[PDB]
Amino acid sequence: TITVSTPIKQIFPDDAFAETIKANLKKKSVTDAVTQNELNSIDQIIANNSDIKSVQGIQYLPNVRYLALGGNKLHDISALKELTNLGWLNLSNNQLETLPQGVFEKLTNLTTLNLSNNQLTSLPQGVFERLASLTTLNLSNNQLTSLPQGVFERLTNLTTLNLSNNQLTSLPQGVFERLTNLTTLNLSNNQLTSLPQGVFERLTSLHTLDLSNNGITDISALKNLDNLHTLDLSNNGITDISALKNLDNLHTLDLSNNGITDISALKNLTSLHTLDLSNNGITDISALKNLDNLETLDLRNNGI
Numbered sequence: 001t002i003t004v005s006t007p008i009k010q011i012f013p014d015d016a017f018a019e020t021i022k023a024n025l026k027k028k029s030v031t032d033a034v035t036q037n038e039l040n041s042i043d044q045i046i047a048n049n050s051d052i053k054s055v056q057g058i059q060y061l062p063n064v065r066y067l068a069l070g071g072n073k074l075h076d077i078s079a080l081k082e083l084t085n086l087g088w089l090n091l092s093n094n095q096l097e098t099l100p101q102g103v104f105e106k107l108t109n110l111t112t113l114n115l116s117n118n119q120l121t122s123l124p125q126g127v128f129e130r131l132a133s134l135t136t137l138n139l140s141n142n143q144l145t146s147l148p149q150g151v152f153e154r155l156t157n158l159t160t161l162n163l164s165n166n167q168l169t170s171l172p173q174g175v176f177e178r179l180t181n182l183t184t185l186n187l188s189n190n191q192l193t194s195l196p197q198g199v200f201e202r203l204t205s206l207h208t209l210d211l212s213n214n215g216i217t218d219i220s221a222l223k224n225l226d227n228l229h230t231l232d233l234s235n236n237g238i239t240d241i242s243a244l245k246n247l248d249n250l251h252t253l254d255l256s257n258n259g260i261t262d263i264s265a266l267k268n269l270t271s272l273h274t275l276d277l278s279n280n281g282i283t284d285i286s287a288l289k290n291l292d293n294l295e296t297l298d299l300r301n302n303g304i
Contacts, residue, residue, distance in 0.1 A: 012057035
């Protein structure tokens, strides 16, 4: 809180963010003195692509619920720690490299967190511990190489998790163990090779899984994902696909650009509507004789 009226440019030292606030309050000038009453009036700030370098001052806006700050120049977000009413936060395409450990401690009402396209090199232990309401977490297009154990352990409401386009080289056993409401998981474009066999097994709501563009060879971790509808495994090192054989809710499967030769395992995937097998070594397609519902099929660049 501010105790006396204070010029906007004094509360909000970043010129672009001061102008954001001025426009939000319909003031004429960043030199106008505002009251705490007025700061309390702000419940939404929509300020993507606004050349904001700092959100200092935002601590004095207790009622902010919706904050769009994508495409700015933020290097630091500590001032957001205080926005206990935040439900929706977009920080995508800024220059965040680290997150202070406690920054999301009080954001217990947050449902959507977009941290994509920053330069995050690590996630502190417990950084998401208090985000019980979170339903969407986007961490894509960062520089993450590993995940702490427990990092997603409290995110039981999560429906969407996007970790694509990082440099993840492994996933800890148990890392998704409590995400029983998760419907979409994107792990494409990492550096994953081995997967703990049990890593997806508690994802009983998983509909969509994208593992494309890794170095995965063994797909045993998929064996029991029988609720899956869409699976992307293109551009990996897969040869044996026997683990797919009981995934009979699968509607869409992309197995392109692997090293597959025997597609016997696809024979009972009778719900498949969309199947991409291109750029493999497949020469026997008689398993396809069982697939009643294929609309789209790609067999190009195989031995046939």
